[PDB]
Design a protein around this ligand. Sequence first.
Ligand SMILES: CC(C)(C)c1cc(NC(=O)Nc2cccc3ccccc23)n(-c2ccc(CO)cc2)n1
Length: 348
Amino acid sequence: RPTFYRQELNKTIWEVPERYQNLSPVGSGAYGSVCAAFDTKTGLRVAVKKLSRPFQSIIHAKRTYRELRLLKHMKHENVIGLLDVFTPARSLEEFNDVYLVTHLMGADLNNIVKCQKLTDDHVQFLIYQILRGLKYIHSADIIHRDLKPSNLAVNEDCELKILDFGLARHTDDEMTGYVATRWYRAPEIMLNWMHYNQTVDIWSVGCIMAELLTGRTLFPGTDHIDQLKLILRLVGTPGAELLKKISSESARNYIQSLTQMPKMNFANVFIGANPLAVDLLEKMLVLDSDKRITAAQALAHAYFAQYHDPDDEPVADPYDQSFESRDLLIDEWKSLTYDEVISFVPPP
Ligand SMILES: CC(C)(C)c1cc(NC(=O)Nc2cccc3ccccc23)n(-c2ccc(CO)cc2)n1
Protein backbone atom coordinates (compact mmCIF):
# COMPACT_ATOMS: atom_id res chain seq x y z
CA ARG A 1 0.00 0.00 0.00
CA PRO A 2 1.35 3.43 -1.03
CA THR A 3 1.27 6.52 1.18
CA PHE A 4 -1.56 8.90 0.31
CA TYR A 5 -1.57 12.67 0.72
CA ARG A 6 -4.43 15.08 0.97
CA GLN A 7 -5.08 18.22 -0.98
CA GLU A 8 -8.09 20.44 -1.58
CA LEU A 9 -8.80 21.58 -5.15
CA ASN A 10 -11.95 23.55 -6.06
CA LYS A 11 -13.74 22.56 -2.80
CA THR A 12 -12.99 18.85 -3.56
CA ILE A 13 -10.67 16.70 -1.43
CA TRP A 14 -8.13 14.67 -3.36
CA GLU A 15 -6.42 11.86 -1.50
CA VAL A 16 -3.91 10.19 -3.83
CA PRO A 17 -0.68 8.14 -3.67
CA GLU A 18 2.53 10.29 -3.46
CA ARG A 19 3.54 9.05 -6.89
CA TYR A 20 1.01 11.49 -8.35
CA GLN A 21 2.22 15.07 -8.14
CA ASN A 22 1.22 18.55 -9.32
CA LEU A 23 -2.53 17.88 -9.40
CA SER A 24 -4.27 20.54 -11.45
CA PRO A 25 -8.10 20.71 -12.02
CA VAL A 26 -9.27 20.10 -15.62
CA GLY A 27 -13.00 19.39 -15.44
CA SER A 28 -15.93 18.88 -13.12
CA GLY A 29 -19.47 17.54 -13.21
CA ALA A 30 -22.26 15.87 -11.29
CA TYR A 31 -20.67 12.41 -11.58
CA GLY A 32 -17.03 13.30 -10.86
CA SER A 33 -14.05 15.60 -11.32
CA VAL A 34 -10.81 15.26 -13.26
CA CYS A 35 -7.29 16.57 -12.55
CA ALA A 36 -4.10 16.50 -14.55
CA ALA A 37 -1.05 15.17 -12.71
CA PHE A 38 2.46 13.88 -13.16
CA ASP A 39 3.05 10.25 -12.37
CA THR A 40 6.60 10.15 -10.93
CA LYS A 41 6.67 6.41 -11.23
CA THR A 42 6.09 6.09 -14.98
CA GLY A 43 7.14 9.58 -15.99
CA LEU A 44 3.72 10.06 -17.62
CA ARG A 45 1.38 13.02 -17.58
CA VAL A 46 -1.89 11.53 -16.35
CA ALA A 47 -5.54 12.33 -15.85
CA VAL A 48 -7.11 11.22 -12.57
CA LYS A 49 -10.90 10.95 -12.34
CA LYS A 50 -12.38 11.12 -8.86
CA LEU A 51 -15.95 9.84 -8.74
CA SER A 52 -18.37 12.05 -6.78
CA ARG A 53 -20.00 10.09 -3.90
CA PRO A 54 -19.72 6.78 -5.85
CA PHE A 55 -22.03 4.79 -3.55
CA GLN A 56 -24.57 7.53 -2.66
CA SER A 57 -27.35 5.78 -4.59
CA ILE A 58 -27.94 2.60 -6.63
CA ILE A 59 -27.54 4.56 -9.84
CA HIS A 60 -24.20 6.03 -8.72
CA ALA A 61 -23.03 2.71 -7.32
CA LYS A 62 -23.84 0.84 -10.52
CA ARG A 63 -22.31 3.57 -12.73
CA THR A 64 -19.13 3.35 -10.65
CA TYR A 65 -18.99 -0.40 -11.08
CA ARG A 66 -19.83 -0.10 -14.78
CA GLU A 67 -17.04 2.39 -15.63
CA LEU A 68 -14.42 0.48 -13.64
CA ARG A 69 -15.42 -2.83 -15.25
CA LEU A 70 -15.29 -1.18 -18.66
CA LEU A 71 -12.03 0.70 -18.29
CA LYS A 72 -10.36 -2.41 -16.86
CA HIS A 73 -11.34 -4.31 -20.00
CA MET A 74 -10.27 -1.70 -22.59
CA LYS A 75 -6.86 -2.57 -24.03
CA HIS A 76 -6.51 -0.86 -27.40
CA GLU A 77 -4.36 1.97 -28.80
CA ASN A 78 -7.44 3.97 -29.90
CA VAL A 79 -9.46 3.61 -26.68
CA ILE A 80 -8.86 5.06 -23.22
CA GLY A 81 -7.04 2.53 -21.00
CA LEU A 82 -6.68 2.32 -17.22
CA LEU A 83 -3.18 3.06 -15.84
CA ASP A 84 -4.26 2.74 -12.22
CA VAL A 85 -7.24 2.67 -9.93
CA PHE A 86 -6.95 3.42 -6.23
CA THR A 87 -8.82 4.19 -3.05
CA PRO A 88 -7.53 5.56 0.29
CA ALA A 89 -9.67 2.90 2.04
CA ARG A 90 -7.88 0.04 3.80
CA SER A 91 -11.03 -2.11 4.00
CA LEU A 92 -14.45 -2.68 2.41
CA GLU A 93 -15.99 -0.98 5.47
CA GLU A 94 -13.82 2.11 4.86
CA PHE A 95 -14.38 2.05 1.09
CA ASN A 96 -16.05 5.29 -0.03
CA ASP A 97 -14.05 6.83 -2.90
CA VAL A 98 -12.75 5.56 -6.21
CA TYR A 99 -10.13 7.23 -8.38
CA LEU A 100 -9.29 6.22 -11.95
CA VAL A 101 -6.08 7.09 -13.75
CA THR A 102 -5.24 7.27 -17.47
CA HIS A 103 -2.83 9.06 -19.87
CA LEU A 104 -3.38 12.79 -19.97
CA MET A 105 -4.37 13.93 -23.39
CA GLY A 106 -5.31 17.59 -22.94
CA ALA A 107 -6.43 18.28 -26.55
CA ASP A 108 -9.65 16.99 -28.09
CA LEU A 109 -10.92 16.94 -31.65
CA ASN A 110 -12.53 20.39 -31.19
CA ASN A 111 -8.96 21.72 -30.65
CA ILE A 112 -8.21 20.39 -34.14
CA VAL A 113 -11.26 21.08 -36.39
CA LYS A 114 -11.46 24.82 -35.53
CA CYS A 115 -7.70 25.59 -35.53
CA GLN A 116 -5.68 23.52 -38.05
CA LYS A 117 -6.34 23.44 -41.79
CA LEU A 118 -6.77 19.67 -42.05
CA THR A 119 -5.76 17.88 -45.22
CA ASP A 120 -7.65 14.88 -46.59
CA ASP A 121 -4.85 12.65 -45.28
CA HIS A 122 -5.35 13.95 -41.73
CA VAL A 123 -9.06 13.22 -42.04
CA GLN A 124 -8.28 9.68 -43.27
CA PHE A 125 -5.96 9.05 -40.34
CA LEU A 126 -8.31 10.54 -37.72
CA ILE A 127 -11.48 8.70 -38.88
CA TYR A 128 -9.44 5.50 -39.44
CA GLN A 129 -8.44 5.56 -35.77
CA ILE A 130 -11.96 6.26 -34.55
CA LEU A 131 -13.25 3.30 -36.58
CA ARG A 132 -10.37 1.12 -35.45
CA GLY A 133 -11.27 1.95 -31.86
CA LEU A 134 -14.99 1.50 -32.51
CA LYS A 135 -14.46 -1.93 -34.09
CA TYR A 136 -12.78 -2.98 -30.88
CA ILE A 137 -15.45 -1.37 -28.64
CA HIS A 138 -18.31 -2.81 -30.73
CA SER A 139 -16.77 -6.33 -30.73
CA ALA A 140 -17.27 -6.30 -26.93
CA ASP A 141 -20.96 -5.44 -27.52
CA ILE A 142 -20.35 -1.98 -26.11
CA ILE A 143 -22.18 1.02 -27.61
CA HIS A 144 -20.59 4.42 -27.02
CA ARG A 145 -23.85 6.37 -27.63
CA ASP A 146 -22.18 9.78 -27.09
CA LEU A 147 -19.47 10.04 -29.68
CA LYS A 148 -18.58 13.69 -30.37
CA PRO A 149 -15.40 15.74 -30.68
CA SER A 150 -15.01 16.40 -26.95
CA ASN A 151 -14.97 12.61 -26.38
CA LEU A 152 -12.01 12.17 -28.75
CA ALA A 153 -8.51 12.77 -27.33
CA VAL A 154 -5.86 13.68 -29.94
CA ASN A 155 -2.12 14.20 -29.42
CA GLU A 156 0.29 16.39 -31.40
CA ASP A 157 0.97 13.49 -33.80
CA CYS A 158 -2.77 13.18 -34.56
CA GLU A 159 -2.90 9.94 -32.53
CA LEU A 160 -6.45 9.46 -31.24
CA LYS A 161 -8.30 7.78 -28.40
CA ILE A 162 -11.99 7.37 -27.82
CA LEU A 163 -13.17 8.12 -24.31
CA ASP A 164 -16.24 9.32 -22.48
CA PHE A 165 -15.83 12.07 -19.96
CA GLY A 166 -19.24 10.98 -18.66
CA LEU A 167 -19.37 13.69 -15.98
CA ALA A 168 -22.81 14.94 -17.00
CA ARG A 169 -26.34 13.41 -16.50
CA HIS A 170 -27.63 13.93 -20.10
CA THR A 171 -30.95 15.25 -18.82
CA ASP A 172 -33.66 16.61 -21.10
CA ASP A 173 -32.38 20.13 -20.31
CA GLU A 174 -28.82 19.14 -21.38
CA MET A 175 -30.11 17.96 -24.82
CA THR A 176 -32.20 21.10 -25.32
CA GLY A 177 -31.60 23.85 -27.83
CA TYR A 178 -28.55 24.83 -29.82
CA VAL A 179 -26.14 22.38 -28.22
CA ALA A 180 -23.22 20.16 -29.27
CA THR A 181 -24.45 17.53 -26.77
CA ARG A 182 -27.14 16.69 -29.33
CA TRP A 183 -25.66 17.47 -32.79
CA TYR A 184 -23.72 14.16 -33.18
CA ARG A 185 -26.60 11.89 -32.09
CA ALA A 186 -28.30 9.37 -34.40
CA PRO A 187 -31.90 10.44 -34.96
CA GLU A 188 -33.22 7.14 -33.54
CA ILE A 189 -31.53 7.90 -30.23
CA MET A 190 -32.29 11.65 -30.30
CA LEU A 191 -36.03 10.97 -30.77
CA ASN A 192 -36.25 7.50 -29.12
CA TRP A 193 -37.62 5.94 -32.30
CA MET A 194 -36.82 2.32 -31.47
CA HIS A 195 -34.43 0.08 -29.58
CA TYR A 196 -31.12 1.18 -30.97
CA ASN A 197 -27.92 -0.66 -31.70
CA GLN A 198 -24.25 -0.05 -32.20
CA THR A 199 -24.79 1.66 -35.57
CA VAL A 200 -25.76 4.78 -33.56
CA ASP A 201 -22.01 5.39 -33.19
CA ILE A 202 -21.47 5.19 -36.96
CA TRP A 203 -23.91 8.05 -37.52
CA SER A 204 -21.85 10.04 -35.03
CA VAL A 205 -18.66 9.17 -36.98
CA GLY A 206 -20.28 10.46 -40.19
CA CYS A 207 -21.16 13.74 -38.42
CA ILE A 208 -17.56 14.08 -37.16
CA MET A 209 -16.00 13.18 -40.52
CA ALA A 210 -18.25 15.68 -42.29
CA GLU A 211 -17.18 18.42 -39.87
CA LEU A 212 -13.46 17.62 -40.30
CA LEU A 213 -14.01 17.90 -44.04
CA THR A 214 -15.93 21.22 -44.03
CA GLY A 215 -14.78 22.77 -40.76
CA ARG A 216 -18.53 23.11 -39.96
CA THR A 217 -21.09 21.30 -37.82
CA LEU A 218 -23.06 18.91 -39.98
CA PHE A 219 -26.44 19.18 -38.23
CA PRO A 220 -26.35 22.19 -35.85
CA GLY A 221 -30.09 22.14 -35.01
CA THR A 222 -31.52 24.78 -32.67
CA ASP A 223 -33.64 22.05 -31.09
CA HIS A 224 -34.64 18.40 -31.65
CA ILE A 225 -37.11 19.21 -34.43
CA ASP A 226 -34.89 21.69 -36.19
CA GLN A 227 -32.10 19.10 -36.10
CA LEU A 228 -34.39 16.36 -37.48
CA LYS A 229 -35.29 18.63 -40.41
CA LEU A 230 -31.62 19.34 -41.17
CA ILE A 231 -30.98 15.60 -41.10
CA LEU A 232 -33.92 14.71 -43.33
CA ARG A 233 -33.10 17.47 -45.75
CA LEU A 234 -29.73 15.81 -46.36
CA VAL A 235 -30.60 12.14 -46.15
CA GLY A 236 -34.24 12.07 -47.27
CA THR A 237 -37.43 11.39 -45.35
CA PRO A 238 -37.89 7.74 -44.24
CA GLY A 239 -39.49 5.25 -46.61
CA ALA A 240 -42.12 2.58 -45.70
CA GLU A 241 -39.57 0.03 -44.49
CA LEU A 242 -37.98 2.38 -41.99
CA LEU A 243 -41.30 3.83 -40.83
CA LYS A 244 -42.49 0.46 -39.55
CA LYS A 245 -39.27 -0.05 -37.57
CA ILE A 246 -40.09 3.13 -35.69
CA SER A 247 -41.93 1.38 -32.86
CA SER A 248 -42.78 4.60 -31.03
CA GLU A 249 -46.16 5.19 -32.60
CA SER A 250 -46.03 8.84 -31.55
CA ALA A 251 -42.69 9.46 -33.31
CA ARG A 252 -43.91 7.61 -36.40
CA ASN A 253 -47.00 9.74 -36.71
CA TYR A 254 -45.02 12.97 -36.41
CA ILE A 255 -42.48 11.92 -39.03
CA GLN A 256 -45.26 10.97 -41.55
CA SER A 257 -46.59 14.51 -41.18
CA LEU A 258 -43.45 15.74 -42.87
CA THR A 259 -43.35 16.75 -46.53
CA GLN A 260 -41.38 14.00 -48.31
CA MET A 261 -37.86 14.91 -49.41
CA PRO A 262 -35.32 13.02 -51.49
CA LYS A 263 -31.77 12.24 -50.33
CA MET A 264 -29.50 15.01 -51.57
CA ASN A 265 -26.50 14.59 -53.78
CA PHE A 266 -23.58 14.40 -51.31
CA ALA A 267 -21.02 15.50 -53.97
CA ASN A 268 -22.93 18.77 -54.12
CA VAL A 269 -22.96 19.13 -50.32
CA PHE A 270 -19.32 18.21 -49.76
CA ILE A 271 -17.87 20.17 -52.66
CA GLY A 272 -14.27 19.27 -53.47
CA ALA A 273 -14.11 16.38 -51.01
CA ASN A 274 -12.30 13.24 -52.04
CA PRO A 275 -15.00 11.17 -53.82
CA LEU A 276 -14.05 8.23 -51.59
CA ALA A 277 -14.87 10.38 -48.53
CA VAL A 278 -18.19 11.29 -50.10
CA ASP A 279 -18.97 7.62 -50.73
CA LEU A 280 -18.06 6.69 -47.18
CA LEU A 281 -20.28 9.51 -45.79
CA GLU A 282 -23.25 8.23 -47.81
CA LYS A 283 -22.69 4.79 -46.29
CA MET A 284 -22.48 6.13 -42.71
CA LEU A 285 -25.27 8.76 -42.87
CA VAL A 286 -28.07 6.33 -43.64
CA LEU A 287 -31.31 6.97 -41.81
CA ASP A 288 -32.06 3.25 -41.28
CA SER A 289 -29.59 1.96 -38.70
CA ASP A 290 -30.00 -1.62 -40.08
CA LYS A 291 -28.32 -0.43 -43.35
CA ARG A 292 -25.49 1.76 -42.02
CA ILE A 293 -21.94 0.52 -42.61
CA THR A 294 -20.33 -1.06 -39.51
CA ALA A 295 -16.90 -0.11 -38.14
CA ALA A 296 -15.36 -3.37 -39.42
CA GLN A 297 -16.88 -2.82 -42.90
CA ALA A 298 -15.75 0.83 -43.02
CA LEU A 299 -12.10 -0.01 -42.15
CA ALA A 300 -12.00 -1.97 -45.44
CA HIS A 301 -13.36 0.97 -47.42
CA ALA A 302 -10.99 2.37 -50.10
CA TYR A 303 -10.86 5.75 -48.36
CA PHE A 304 -8.52 4.14 -45.79
CA ALA A 305 -6.30 2.17 -48.21
CA GLN A 306 -3.19 3.91 -46.92
CA TYR A 307 -3.90 2.88 -43.29
CA HIS A 308 -5.97 -0.33 -43.33
CA ASP A 309 -4.26 -3.44 -42.04
CA PRO A 310 -6.65 -6.32 -41.36
CA ASP A 311 -3.96 -7.97 -39.21
CA ASP A 312 -3.64 -4.87 -37.02
CA GLU A 313 -7.30 -4.05 -36.20
CA PRO A 314 -7.91 -6.23 -33.16
CA VAL A 315 -11.19 -7.17 -31.47
CA ALA A 316 -11.82 -7.20 -27.69
CA ASP A 317 -11.70 -10.14 -25.30
CA PRO A 318 -15.23 -11.28 -24.37
CA TYR A 319 -16.86 -8.73 -22.06
CA ASP A 320 -19.46 -10.06 -19.58
CA GLN A 321 -22.00 -7.36 -18.92
CA SER A 322 -24.55 -9.74 -17.36
CA PHE A 323 -24.40 -7.37 -14.36
CA GLU A 324 -26.33 -4.77 -16.40
CA SER A 325 -29.61 -6.62 -15.77
CA ARG A 326 -28.74 -7.52 -12.19
CA ASP A 327 -30.81 -6.12 -9.38
CA LEU A 328 -28.49 -5.28 -6.47
CA LEU A 329 -28.35 -3.14 -3.36
CA ILE A 330 -25.88 -0.26 -3.01
CA ASP A 331 -23.60 -2.33 -0.75
CA GLU A 332 -23.53 -5.19 -3.23
CA TRP A 333 -22.49 -2.86 -6.09
CA LYS A 334 -19.94 -1.42 -3.69
CA SER A 335 -18.45 -4.80 -2.76
CA LEU A 336 -18.24 -5.79 -6.43
CA THR A 337 -16.47 -2.50 -7.18
CA TYR A 338 -14.06 -3.12 -4.28
CA ASP A 339 -13.22 -6.59 -5.66
CA GLU A 340 -12.39 -4.92 -8.98
CA VAL A 341 -10.23 -2.25 -7.33
CA ILE A 342 -8.25 -4.80 -5.30
CA SER A 343 -7.68 -7.15 -8.22
CA PHE A 344 -6.51 -4.46 -10.69
CA VAL A 345 -3.18 -5.26 -12.35
CA PRO A 346 -1.37 -2.27 -13.91
CA PRO A 347 -0.12 -2.26 -17.51
CA PRO A 348 3.47 -3.52 -18.03
C1 LIG B 1 -14.93 2.66 -23.17
C2 LIG B 1 -15.81 3.88 -23.43
C3 LIG B 1 -17.15 3.39 -23.99
C4 LIG B 1 -15.13 4.77 -24.49
C5 LIG B 1 -15.92 4.57 -22.08
C6 LIG B 1 -14.88 5.29 -21.49
C7 LIG B 1 -15.43 5.70 -20.27
N1 LIG B 1 -14.92 6.44 -19.22
C8 LIG B 1 -13.98 7.39 -19.38
O1 LIG B 1 -13.52 7.66 -20.49
N2 LIG B 1 -13.55 8.01 -18.28
C9 LIG B 1 -12.62 9.05 -18.19
C10 LIG B 1 -12.86 10.22 -18.94
C11 LIG B 1 -12.01 11.34 -18.87
C12 LIG B 1 -10.89 11.30 -18.03
C13 LIG B 1 -10.63 10.15 -17.28
C14 LIG B 1 -9.50 10.15 -16.46
C15 LIG B 1 -9.19 9.02 -15.70
C16 LIG B 1 -10.01 7.91 -15.77
C17 LIG B 1 -11.17 7.92 -16.57
C18 LIG B 1 -11.49 9.03 -17.35
N3 LIG B 1 -16.69 5.20 -20.20
C19 LIG B 1 -17.63 5.32 -19.24
C20 LIG B 1 -18.43 4.21 -18.90
C21 LIG B 1 -19.44 4.23 -17.94
C22 LIG B 1 -19.71 5.41 -17.27
C23 LIG B 1 -20.80 5.43 -16.22
O2 LIG B 1 -21.91 4.61 -16.61
C24 LIG B 1 -18.94 6.55 -17.57
C25 LIG B 1 -17.94 6.49 -18.54
N4 LIG B 1 -17.03 4.48 -21.33
